[model samples]
Target chain A: SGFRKMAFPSGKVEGCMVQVTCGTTTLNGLWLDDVVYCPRHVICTSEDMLNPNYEDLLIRKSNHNFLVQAGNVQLRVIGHSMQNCVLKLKVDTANPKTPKYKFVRIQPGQTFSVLACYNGSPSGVYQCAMRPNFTIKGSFLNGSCGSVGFNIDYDCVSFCYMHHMELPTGVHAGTDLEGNFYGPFVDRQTAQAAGTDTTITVNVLAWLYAAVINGDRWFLNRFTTTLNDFNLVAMKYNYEPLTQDHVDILGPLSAQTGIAVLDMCASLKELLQNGMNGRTILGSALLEDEFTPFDVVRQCSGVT
Target chain B: SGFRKMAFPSGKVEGCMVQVTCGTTTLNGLWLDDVVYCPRHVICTSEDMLNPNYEDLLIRKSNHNFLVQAGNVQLRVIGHSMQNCVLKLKVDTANPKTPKYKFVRIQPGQTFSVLACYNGSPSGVYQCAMRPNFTIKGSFLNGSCGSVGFNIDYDCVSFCYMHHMELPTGVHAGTDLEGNFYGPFVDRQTAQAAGTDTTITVNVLAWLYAAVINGDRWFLNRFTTTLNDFNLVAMKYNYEPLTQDHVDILGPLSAQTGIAVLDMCASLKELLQNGMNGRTILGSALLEDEFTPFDVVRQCSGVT
Candidate 1:
C-alpha cells in the first residue's frame, strides 16, 4: 500500500489548510474527490470548477464602453455541436475595436469559446463605443450556425471578471403567433432545484445594438409581438408610441422572477379565453406592448 | 405572366408522365423566369428544404448489451475537455434505423469515431454476427460530466414501435430482501411515460429485455410508492419465506391505479415492531443482496 497527501501553501495563512491523504487500499489514491484547486491563480479555480457557489467576475463600464487589458487569459470558443466557431477579442466598452481574428465557417461540431490569460489584464468588463450603422453590417453569420435567431456567444474582456449568475426562473413559453403556449416549462426543474432562497445580482448590462437604415415603428411592433409570444417579456418596452403604461406594472415583476411575468401573461390569456371580463384583466398584453419605456426599465430594473 | 403545359409518355405506367413548360417574359434579352422542363424522372426546380429529424438505429443484445450503429447517421465529433466521454444519440422512432445525429460529450465539444454497422446473423437482436462487434462506443468520460446524472442535450430515443402492448394492471404485495408492500398501483400513465408500454410484440421483445437491464427498476418502487401514498388499502397475505406466491399476489396490485404498496409494507413493519399481528414483512436486505431473481418482475409478469 502507498499513500500521498495534497496540501496548498497555507502555513502562513490564517485559515485552516485543505489537506487530503491517500493510501493504496481498495479506495485509497490521490483523491481529487470534489475539491477545486487553481493552478493558474494559485488562489481560485475556474468558476463552477469545484465550488458550487463561485460567482462570475464583474466589471463596470465608465461610459457606454470601456477598455480592458486582457493580461494572461487565453481565449477559446465552445458550442454544443461545434467546437470553435467564433473568436472575438475587444478592449473598448461603448464601441470597442475588435481586432481581426481568423474567420471560420461553423459546421455541426463548433459552438462556444473561452480565453485563458497568462499575462496582462486577461479579462475585464468593457464596452465598445462604436455601434453598427446598419442592421446587416457585422459578421452575424460568422458566429454560430446551427439555428438562427439566437444570441451570439461573445465574451467581453471586462465582462469576464464578474461571477457567473444562475439563470433566473419563469415560464419559457414557446408560442405560435396567436399566443398559443407550445412549451412553457423547458427549464422549471433547474430553476426550482437551485432552491427558493438564492438571489442573483446583475453586474453590468451590454447591449448588442443593430439598426435598420430605413426601419421604422412597424419593425418594432413585429419584433415586440414575436418576443412577447415567446415569453420573453424583458424586451417588450424597446421603443416608444409602441409602449404601454401597464408595462411599468409588470416590468418589476418580470425582472425579479425574470420568467414569472411571462407565466402571468400566458395565464391571463388563458383566463381571458375562459371568459374573464376584458377590463378586469389588470395587465393587458396590449398595454405591455405599447406603453412601457425600454430605457426606464433598463435603468431601474437592471434589464438589458 | 405567361403559362404553358405539356403531357407525358403514352405508355407510362402508374399514370406517370413527363411535363414541360415554356414562358416568355423578357424586357429585351434576359428571360424573366426562363423555361421549365423535366426529362423522365428529372425534377427541374428544387423546393426549399425543411429541418431534418435524424432517427436512431440501435440493437439490444441477448446478454443485455446494447449497441448504436453510428456510421449511418450524420454528425461531426470535435474536441472535448475530457477524454472517454460518452456521446448519447437521440433516436427518432418515426424512422428508427435513421437517427437524427446529435453528438453529446461530457465536456460539450469533443470528437470521436462511431462504428456504423456490425457483422452478425440477423437472429441476434443486439449483437453483430461478425467478429469485431458492430458497436459504436461513445466516450465514457462524456456521459459522467453533465450537470445531472444524465445528459440533457440528448433526448432518449422515442421507441414507439417497441410500445404497442398494454401493461397489465392491478394491485400486488410481495416481500423482497428490502421489504414488502401491498396495494401497489402501476397505473397506465406511469407505464406509458416510463417506456414500458412499447413492448408491442415478442419478435421485438429484445428491446424490452434490454430495457429491463438498462432502465431503472426503482421506477417500479417509485411508481408503487407514488400510487400507494395516494391510496388507503389493507390486504393481508402470509409470508412463506418470500416465495413466488407472495409476488403473484402483490404484483398485480402494485400495477393497479391509485395505489401504492410501499406504505402498506411500512405499516406492516410498524405493526410487527409493535408486537402486533399483521402481514409478515419478510425478506431481509441480505436476501435481496444475495439473490436478485426478484428483479425479474417484468419477465415474470406473465405478459409473454
Candidate 2:
C-alpha cells in the first residue's frame, strides 16, 4: 500500500535475481529496478508466433483463471517440453504480477511491440487492460512442437534516477547485518562487490530496458517526464544538448550504449515497437501493480 | 527481465518498508509479496473526492511526463498543504509499476475502486489502459485544503500460499548477512523482531489488499482462480465445503477473517467495487509492470 526497500548481491546486476525475505514468506524474483534485459539475442522461431487480440487474450486467460479461483475449475502452466536445451517453453510464475500472454507472435528475424502508458498520452501506447513489463519470461515455443536449445539473457543493473547530478540527492540508507548496505555506487563492480564489514558501498538500475522491452509505461512516462525536465533545464542553461552522462540516470542498459534518458527512451520506444517473439509472451498475466506503482522516494534516514 | 531476491526486518510484512540496495540503486519500497496494507482506518472528509475519467487522467499526466522525458518539459509533485498534518497531501512514486489515479474519489465515509486483469477473465475487471495496485498514496484533499493531520496505516506481513497444505510448498531460501533470515513464522511480532541471528526467520505478502483497494485485478484474478481451483478440488473430494484455513493463501487480510479463498475473493471484489477516496489518487502513474507480475516462487536453495 505504500513504499518499501530491498537489497541485492554484488555483481552484474543486470538480469540479476535476489532472494526476497519479507516476513513469513520468501520468493525469488527481480525488483523492477533490478529488471532490465535487452536480449543479446532473441530466438528465430519457425512456428506460428501469434499475438491474439491482446486485451481479448488477456480477458480469456484471466477469466479462465478467475474460474479457477472461483472454484469453478483449475489452472496451471502445462509445459510440454521434450528435450535438452537450457531454454525451453516454460511458464513464469515467479512474477505473478508481471503480465504474460499467448497469441502475440513474432516470425524468424522479426518482432512485435506492446505499449501502455496508463497515466500518459494514450497515443502510441497499447490500450490493453495492462501492459508488458518490458522484460521477457519463458517461451511457450507456441506450445510443444520444436527442436530448440538456448538460454535467455537475464542481465540487468539495479536502477536509479540521478540525472545531471554528480552528488546524490538522498542521504545514505544504513546497512543491515546481512552484508547488505544501502548507498550509491558510481562504478558497477563496486556495486556487486562488498566492503569488508566496512566496504562502504551502495546499490541499484537494470529496470530501464525491462520496462521498454514490453513497452511498459512507467519507464516511458518517466523518460518522457525526464526528457521534458531536461529540455527545460537545457533552455534555462542556454540550450544545452542532451548528454550521455545525464541519461545515466536511466541506468546501465547495454542497449544504451548511449545518451542519455532521451536517446535511451527512443531506443526503448523502438524496442517496444520492435517487440519479441510472441510465443515467449503468448499473452500477459495479471501484472498490474496498482497500489504504489510509482517510486515513492522515502524520507531517508542515517543521514551522513 | 529475470528473478531476484530481498530480505526483511522481522515485523508485520504488510506495508513494511525495506532498504533496497541492488547494485547501484537503493529504494525504500515493498516487495509485492511483502506488500499488504488493509487500512485499519480510512478518513471521513468533507471535501470533494474526485474520480476523474481514470484512463484519461493517467493519459494526461503521463503524456506531460513523456514530454519531460522527451526533453519537452518536466514534472514534480506539488504538495499544497496548509497547517498541522502529519498526514497531508503528498505524491507517491514508490512502486512505479502499480497504477494510481485521480478522479476516482470517495465521499465522506464513502468509497471508490478500480480493477485490472491483464491476462485473465477480463469480464469483471477494468478495461482501462491499466488497473490500480489496490493501495492508496498521498491524498490531494482537492489541492490546497483546509486542515488535517494524520498517519496512514502501514502494517503488513510477508506472505505465502500454503492452502490445503499443513506445510509450505518450497525449500527455505537462505539468510543474509544482515539481521535478515528466510523461513516462515506464524506469529506477526516474531516477524518484526530478530532471533539469535538464527531464530529461523523468513519473509513476504501484503500486496494482496494493496491491489484490491484500488480494484486492481491481479489479486481478483488470483482469487477467482483459487476459488474455481478450490471448487474443483471440492468436487474431487465429493463436494467438500470451503474452509478458513485454506483461504490463508490470500494472506491475512482483516477482511479475509472469513474467507476460504472463495469468500475472500468476494470480500475483495466488493472492496474493488467500493473503492477509496479519490483525491488520494488524482490519476495513476505509469504502473504497468510489463515484465514479471505474478508470484514466481523460485527454486529454493536450502532444503529442509
Candidate 3:
C-alpha cells in the first residue's frame, strides 16, 4: 500500500496501472514504469522490460525476493507479482559469471513457492528479479525492473564440508553432489526416504554446517558437545576422535569453501557406516541426548 | 598307523617301500612311488607321477580328502598326508572337468593347518590326492591316480542360491564371489571383522547352505527354523520375507546345479543387510535359541 511515481513508454497506458488503497495508504503505480515503490505496490514497467530477443534488459526486483522458508537442503522463494511474471534467481558470489541460476514463472492465481539449493554451494545473499516476459531469455538478467528488487542472505556453514577437508586424499570419489556408486553424498531427501542413514547423516551434517555458518550459536554449541561425545565413543571403538579444529574451520561459508566443504562432507560420509544409527552405537553416551543432526536441521532450518 | 600295498614301474624296488610298525599297525609306503595306498601307506605309480620336466607332479589323494572343518563360508580340507606331498583338491560333482581346484605342497615338518574352499562353488563330494611332484605344473591339473580314488560327498543345499534365482532381473549385478560395489557378499571373515553386517549376513547364509547340502539334518532343520524366525522379523520391519521355497531348492548338490547354486547363494547374500545383529532384532522371538550359523558349521564340519 505504498505509492511511487510511474511512467510508461506510451504515456499513461490504459488498464496498465491499477490503484488500490489499503489502510491510510493509497497505492497507485504505472503499468509500465521503471521505478517500483515500497511494500505492497505491484506494478509493471516497459523500460528495461524483457524483450524476447534481448534478455539482459530484464532486471531484478529487490523488494519481492526474500527467503520465505528453509530446509535442511533447500530454501523457498516467495513474494513477487503473479501475473505474467518471470523470476530469475541467483546467489551473490565473488564470481560474476557463476552459471547457477534458477528461473521461475509465476502466473495469475498461482503461488510461487521456495526454490531449493544445495548446502554445499556458496552460501551468501541471494537476489531475485521479476521480468515482464514469461520466459528467461538470457543466461544472466542484468537490468532492473519496475518492482524493487529483493535480497535474502543465507548464512550457513557445512560441517560435512569441513570434515571432508580433514580426510586423506583419494578417500573421496565421484561428483561433489552426486555420490559414487558406493560412496559419498547423494540426494539427501531421496537417501533418507530410502533409509540410507549413512547418506542422511552426511546430508544432515552439511545442513548443520549451514547453521554453524549462519551463526546459530545454540546449534554450534550442541553440535560441538555431541562431537565430543562421539569422539569419546570413537576412542572406545579404537578410532581417532574428530578434532575441534575441524569444527573451527567451518564458518563464513563461501563459494570456494562451501564447495570444498561439500566435497569433504561427502568424503567423510563414505568413512562412516550405518550412518547415525551406527554413530549412536559408537557414541552410546549420546543416546540420552536428543541433539541429533535431524534435531539440529529441524530447529535451525525450520524443516523436517 | 595303517598299511597298504605299494607299486611302481621298477619291480620290487628296493628302499622304495619302507616298513615301520607303530601301535599294532605296520605302515609301509613307497619313498618315491607314483601310486599312494589307502589308510596309511602312501605309495605312488610312475604313470601319474610328473615327469622331471614338470616342476611338480600334482597328485590328489582322494581317501584323505574329507571336510575336516566348516566355517561361516568355507570348508577346511584336513586329514590328508601333507609331507613331501603335492596335494590336489577339487569339489567332486557330476562334471568330470570342474576347473575349481586348490593345490598345495606339503613338505616334511611343514604344517598344513587350513585348506579353505569357497562355499559358493560346486557342492557335492570333495576328493584330494597326493601326486608325485612338488609344483602343480599347470593351472588345470589333469590325469588321475588309482587307490580306488576316495570320495567324501558334501550334501550341501544353499538357500542363498535359491533366493538369487527368485530375484528380479537386473537386481544381480556381479559374478558370484565378486561383489557389486554396493550390494552384498564380500569375504565373510573380512566383512565380519570390518563389521559390515550386510556382507556378514550374506556370508553367513552362504555357509548355512553348505551345512544343508552336507546332509546335516540337525543343522538344516535348525537353519530353516531360524530363517523362518528371520522372515517374521522381516515382516515386522516392513521388509519382504524370505520364502521357504528358497530353502527347498538348495539340495542334492551336483556339478551342473552345484555351481549355479553356489552362484545363486553369492547373489542372494547381497540382498540381506545388517547381518547377525539385524537378524537378532528381527527374530528376537528366537532369542533363547542358541542355534546359529557358526554353531551349525562347527557341529557339522567339526571346525571352530
Candidate 4:
C-alpha cells in the first residue's frame, strides 16, 4: 500500500455560493470575483452591480471549498443590503447523502460571522449553497423560494480526481464560447461543459481511440488544439473576435481532455445542421499534426 | 489561512495486521487489494504468494494512510476482524519526536466506529500506525510494534510545493523499479522512491544540480529520459525484457523529477557494481540537448 490515499472530496469541486439581496428580494447568481462584482456588467442582479455599500455587506468571500476532513466548516455574511436581510447557508453530504441547513438574520447595518462544523456523514462529498432573504412588510421572504426564481449556485467537494482542469494561473478571466464577457469571475466553464457532454454520450470514436484506448499524448495535444479551434469557430459564429488569452485558462491536457469531447459534440451538431463547411478556420500552428479536420469529423460521424 | 486545512484521518490508513491464521497460526507482510487475494502466485503472505477467499472475508479493504494537518491530531477504526483485536493506533508528532498510543478493543464482527480527536501539541508531521495485541499466544507477536518492524506508511499533506509531478493525461500505470505490475494504481511513485534516495543520500549529483538547483525544465526532460534508459539497463541485468508501458506511467518531468533521482540512484548502484560499461544505447530525440551521458556518469561518480 505505497500510495497516497486521496483525502475524500479531493479534486476540483465547487466551493461557496454568494448572492445579493435587498428588502424581501434576493438576487441570485450575481457574479463575484475576489474584490469586485462582475467588473464588465456582463452579469448582475440589482440595478447597479456596484451599489457603493455592497462590499460593506459583502463582508467575506469563501471562494475555495472546505475540505471534508477539515473539522470546522464556516462562511461569512455582511449586511450590504440597506434593508434587513437573512443569509441562509446550507451544507450537505452526497455519499449516504445528508443535509445541514442554517440561517442567520442580519439587520440593515449589521455584521454576522461564525465558524461552524457540519453535522452529517464524515466521508462524503460536502456541498455548500447560500441564499439571501430580505424582510418585506415585517415578513422575511426567501429569494430561492419565490416565483422570481433565482438559481442557488452551490460549491461541492469530493474525493474523486487528483487535479481539476482549471484555467491556468496568470489568466484571470475572459469570454466563454458564447460572446459573454466574463471578467475576473474566471471559472472552470470548460470542465463544466465537458461534464455535461460526456455524462450523456460519446460520438467521436477517434477521441476514444487516441485518448482512452491508446493513451497517446500526441493525440491529446491535437485534441486540445482542436477544442480551442472549435471555441474560436463558435465565437466566430456569434461574431466575436477571439481574445488574446482565450486558450490560456483552458489549462493542461490532463484536465482539458474532456473539453475535447464537448467540442467534438458541438462540431458534430454544427456539421449535421450546416455541412462540412461548418468547420472553423483551423490553420493554427498547434494543429499542424498528423490528423486532419476530415479525419476528426469522420471519426465523430463514426465513419472511421 | 488562505488554504483549506486538511482533515485528520480523512480516509483509510495502514492500521490493521495482515496475518494468515490456521488454528492460531499466523503470517505477516501479505498483499491485499480489496476483495481479491494475490492469487497471482508471484507474491503473497510471506514466501510464495497465493491465498484465496481473501475476498469473501476481505470484502472490506481500507488500505491507505491518513493525513494530519502537519498539525491537528486524530484517528478512527472499525471493528471488522473476527477477533478482539486491540487497535493500537499510534500518533507520532515529530518536529523532533513525540509518540502517543491508545488501545481500543474491537469485538468480532462489531461495527464499532468513533472519531477520537487528539489534543496534542500542533505543527508537526504526525504519523499513525497500529498493533493488534503485542503478545499473541505468549510468544511476542510483533504487530508493527518493534523498532525493526514499524513499517507504518503515513500519509501527509502540506501546502509546500507549487505542483506535484504527475503522469500526463493519457498515461495510466506502469512497473516500478522492483518489477511489479501496477494498473490504475496511478501513484506518484517518484516522490516515494525519492524519499528513500536523496532524503537519505545522493549519488546522482548531476541530476541533483540540474533539477533541484537549476530547476531547469529542459534538464528535467532529459533526466527522465536517461532514467528510462537506465531502467532498460537494469532490466537487462535482471535478465528480463522491458514490458510495454514500462516507462509510460513514469509521468511528466514536472511531477516525476523525483524519478530522475530514483533512476540516478539505481544507475549509480549499477555503475559501482558493474562498471562504466553499464551506460549506453542512450541517444534519443528528447535528449538532444546540452547534457551528456559522460557528464551524468561523472556526476554519479562525484568526480564533477
Candidate 5:
C-alpha cells in the first residue's frame, strides 16, 4: 500500500479560519496547500485584539476647550452637523490644573445606576447607562497618562450578527437598535448569511455609526493633517473619509465582489506614516500602543 | 548600450510599512524581497483596521440580570478582584421591557459637567463625568440593535506614545494615570523606545490595564467554554487566561521576544471557533464585521 496520505487533516476543516504566530516548525494552517485537510483551526495568540487609527489634530493653539467625537456621523445632523459623540480637550496650556476633567454629551435615560464599586473600575471608569444604547463615563487625570486610556476590542454589531447569526435559531433573532425584527445588519450581509432579514435603509448608516465609535479611518494612501502634509495625499487616486458615503457604495460591501472596510485608526497607519500620527480616543496618548509595528500594509480596502 | 536599472523606488524606504488590499495589480509593499527600494509604502486600503477576538460565551441561564465586565480583571480585589469595568446584562426573558436600560460602575470625580448636547449624542448616549479620567453615558434599546451598537477603533495608548512620542519635544512628557510624572508604562518598553522613561512598576500592570479595556484574550491553542469543549483544549500545553499573571510573564509582553498581544474580542476568534461565539461591547451584535474573511490569516501572533 502507498505510504503517502492525502494531505494533512483527514477529519474536519469546515469552519477553520484566521491567522497566527506559530513556532517556526509549526506550519500555519491558514496557509499551506490542501487547506481542506488541516485539522487545527488557527487564531491570534499573543497578538493585539485592538487596533486604533490615530488621526492627527494640530491642537493648533491650546488653552481653549475643544470638542471632538466620532467623525463619520455628527450629532447636529443639520447645519454642519455634529459628531456621533463628543469629547472636550480641556487644555489649560497656560493655566495648569485644567481642573483635569471636562464633559462631552449625554442622552435622556429611563435607567440609572452607579458603576463605581469598592475596588473601582479600569480607565478610572465611573458611571454607565443603557437604553437606546450603552455608554460609560470616566476621566483622564492630567499629567497622568500611560495609565491606560480609552481602548476596547470592537467592531460593529453587524460583523457579530452575521458571523454566527445563523447558529442561534438554528438562527436566532433579536430587535436591532433600529428595531429591526431580524436584528442588526440583517438588511445587508445576513440576507443570505442570516435569514428573514432586512437596508441601506440603515445598514450603511449603522456601519457609519460603528466606524465612528471604532475610531477608525477610511482611504489609505490619503489623510488629513494639521498643516496639509497628509492633506495633499487625500487628493490622489484612492481616497475617501471613513464616512457613510463610502459605506453606501457597497450594498453591503460584504456582499459585493470585493468587500471593504476602514482601518483601526492608528494600528497600521501610524507605523507607516512618516510623521505626526494623531491621538487615540479621548486625550489618552498619541497612537494606540496595542498595534505592533510591521512593514506591510496588509489590512484590506477599496471599491467592491 | 546599457539602460539597466535597479528595482523600484531607488530612493527612500526607511520607514515603509503595513499591509494593503489594492486594485487588480497593486503591489503590497509589506512584502517584496528587496523592500529597501520600494517607494509606495503599503497600508490597508478597503481592508479592516479593527480585528477582534470573538470568544464563546454561554449565557445559559443568564436571567434576573447579571453583571459581566472585562474578564481579564475584576472588582473584588479579595475574592474576585472585580473587573477593569462592569456591565449589567439586564434580562427579563419573562418580563419584557426589562426597564429598557441598565447602569454600571462609577468613579468619583471633582470636575463635573453635563455632556447631553443639542441634537443629543449617539448610542442613545446620556450623562458623563470627568476628573481623574473622562467618561460618557449612553443606553442601548432592546428589540433594537443594528441601529448602531458599540464599536470603536481602539488599541491602548502605549502604541501611540511610542510611535510618535519621539517627535513631541525631541520627546514630550506627561503625568501617567498612575500618578507618575513620566506617564504610564514608561518604565518598561520605553527604556529605549520612550526616554527618564521608567518598571513593572506597572509597565506589565499598565499593559494589563490595557488588555482588559481592549476586551481581548490570551492563549490561542486553548480556550474556555460552557462544556469542556474549549476547556479541555486549555489543559493541553500552551494555555492561560487573559490576566495580569500572563502579562507579567513578559515585563510587558510587548517588550519580550516575539512581542505578545491579545485579540479584539470576537474578531479572529469568532471567525475560527465555530459554534457559540460571544457578543461585542454592551451586549451589542455578535462577532464584529470589521475584519474581512480571507483564505489565509496573515495577521501575526505567538512567541516572539
Candidate 6:
C-alpha cells in the first residue's frame, strides 16, 4: 500500500503492534499517563483492529531470518524507548547453549513480525540495550539491530525491604535509610518538611485536638469535678471563664491539621458499642495501623 | 431495730428505699455519665484493666429499668445532716408514673436505701412529711430517728438528655455554635448562650487533630491533596492556626474531647468490619439510613 504504515491481515500478529517510521519522529513503547495522538496517523480498518483488544497489548521481539529470506530487510531499530517502563518483558531461546537472538530489518512496502517468548522462568528482569554501530533512521538503515536478555525467575513479590529497614514495628520511623523519618510515602523531602521529627505524645494531645475541633461538650463532664478542685485548691478561688487556660492548653494541639483523631473516636465509638474494648480500640493502632479505611477516603477525595 | 443503711444481699439493689432530706441545702443531683464498666469486664476478666469495654457499660433505660447494669453508682448526693431531716428527693425519673418509684428517699446510716413495693402505681411521686421531726446518728428509739419513704430503685436509669442530641451535619453557614452553650437539650440559655456561642466547623479539623495528636503519618497522605484544598476551597482560606480569634471561630458549636471522637471512631470501625450497617451499628440509629462500611469509616474518621 502507498508508503503508508504496513497493514497486516488477520492472524498476522499475536500481540499488540505499532507502526513507526524508521527515521521520522514517532512515539513508541508503553505509556502510563495520558497520550496525545499525533498528526499523520494511519488509521487501521475495522477488520484489522477487530481481534486485537487494546488490553491484549504485549512486548514483542523480531527475527531477522525471515526478513533476509524475503529480501526486504532494510530498517533499523531505535534506542531509549523503554525508560520509565514498568512490567518489562524479557525474551530468551529454548536452546540456551548457543543463545541465539535474531533482529528484523524492515524495508519500504514490506511487513515484519515480532514474537513473544517466555524464557522458562516464573519471573525475570529485562533491560534495554542498543547495538553499538547502528543508527536507526529512514533510508539510512544498516543491517544491525539490538536484542534483550532475561534474568529468569526473579522474584515478582516485592518484599519492600524499605519498610523493615526503617520502621521495624513501634520504632516510630518512616521508610528510609536513616530510619528517623515519618512519612506517608509521599517522597523524601516531605520527611522533615513540616518540622520536628520527634515522636508525638499522643494521649494529652489527641484529646486536646478532639475538644478543640469536634466541640465535644462531654469533655467538660470529665473535667468539671477536677476543675472545681483546681479552682478551689490550686487557683484558690472560683474558676473564671476568661482566666481558664483549659481551652488555651488544648488549643495548640487541637489546632494541628492532617489528622484523624476525631475520626478515630467516631470509629472507636462504633467499635465499643459493638462490645469492643474502647482503650484497645484507640491506643497504638490509632497511629500504627497502615491500612485504615480513612486513608481510602482521603485518597478518593484527592487529599495530599 | 436501729435505723441503718440496708445493704442488699445481691450487692446490687433492684430497688432502693430513699428518704429525701428537705432543707436549705438541696441534694445536688447525681451526675451520672454512661456506665464505664463494659459487659466484657464482667465476662472477660483477662482483658486489660485500662481497656474496659464500654459497650456493655452503655446503660439504656427502657420501661424504667437499666438495659444492662454493670457499673458502680457514683452518686454525689450531698446534703447537710440535720434533726428530723425532711429529705426531699428530686429524681429525674425516666418513668415518672411508675409505681415502683414509691417513697423515694436517701435512706439511713450515712448511706442510701429504699424499700420495694410492687403495688400503688410504683410510687410515681413520693414526698415524706416529717412526723415529729426525728433525727439520730445510727441508734433508733420509738420516736423514730431517720427519714422514712419509698426505696430508690438502684436499677433505675437516669441519663442526661444532652448525650443524645443530634450533631451538626454537612457545611452550615454563619458561624457554628460552640462552647457550653451548645447543648444536650435546649433551654432558654441554649439560645442566650449564643452570645458566647461558637461554631467550630466539624470539617477535616477534627480528623486533623487526631492525626497530629496520634502521630499518624498515614494522615499526611491527604495533607497536600485534601486539607490544602479544603482550606483554600471549602473554608475559603478564612481561618488560620493558633489564634484566639480562631478559637472564637471554632469553640462554640460542640465540645468533642478527643476521647469522644476516638470512642466514636472505634465504635464505627468495629461495626463496619463486622458488616453492620448504620442502624445495626452504634451511631446508625442516629443516621437516617444505613451507610456503606467505607462511609461509616469516613463519617467516624471525620472525613464527611
- By DockQ, the best candidate is 2
TM-score of each: 0.18, 0.21, 0.16, 0.21, 0.19, 0.16
Which prediction has more favorable DockQ, 3 or 5?
Answer: 5
lDDT of 2 by residue, A1-304 (tens): 1111211111121112222221222222122221211110112112211222223322323211211110111223223121211111222233233222121222111111111101110001111111111112111111111111111122222122111101121111111111122233221112232222210000111233333332333323334435554445444423223444434433444333333445444433433444332211102211122111111111011110
Q: Please give the distance, in angstroms, between residue A43's alpha carbon in candidate 3 and its true position after superposition.
A: 99
What lDDT would candidate 2 get against the real structure? 0.21
Instruction: Note the chain A TM-score of all models in turn.
Output: 0.18, 0.17, 0.17, 0.21, 0.15, 0.18
lDDT for residue A184 in candidate 4, whole number 0-100? 27
lDDT of 6 by residue, A1-304 (tens): 0000111111111111122221222211111111111111111222423343222232232222101100122222221112111122122211112211222222111111111111110010111111111111111001100111111111111111111111211121111111211233221212222222221112223333432333333222211223333323322211122223433433344345333334333332333234322222111212211111222122112221
Residue A221 shift from truth in candidate 5, angstroms: 6.4
DockQ of predictions, in order shown: 0.01, 0.03, 0.00, 0.01, 0.02, 0.01
**Candidate 1 lDDT, tens digit per residue, A48-73?**
22432212211221211211122122
User: How much does each candidate deviate from the true structure in C-alpha RMSD?
Assistant: 25.6, 25.7, 34.0, 25.6, 29.0, 33.5
lDDT of 6 at A216: 30
True contacts kept of 1: 0.00
Q: For residues B48-92, could you state the per-residue lDDT of candidate 2 as single tens digits?
A: 112223233233332112110101112222231211111112222
Give the DockQ-based CAPRI class for model 6.
incorrect
Docking quality (DockQ) of candidate 5:
0.02
Worst 10 residues of 6 chain A by lDDT: A1-10
TM-score of chain A of 5: 0.15
Deviation of model 1 at B44, angstroms: 12
Q: Write the per-residue lDDT of candidate 3 for residues B1-304, one digit (tens) a residue.
A: 0000101101111112222221222222222222222122112233422222122321333433332111122222322343222222222222221222222223211111101011211101111111111111100100111111111112111101001110121111111111111133221112111111111232234334443343222322212235655655445444334444434433333231343433433333332333333222111211111122322232233220
In model 6 chain B, the worst 10-residue window by lDDT is: B170-179
Q: lDDT, candidate 5, residue A89? A: 24
- Report the TM-score of candidate 1, chain A only: 0.18
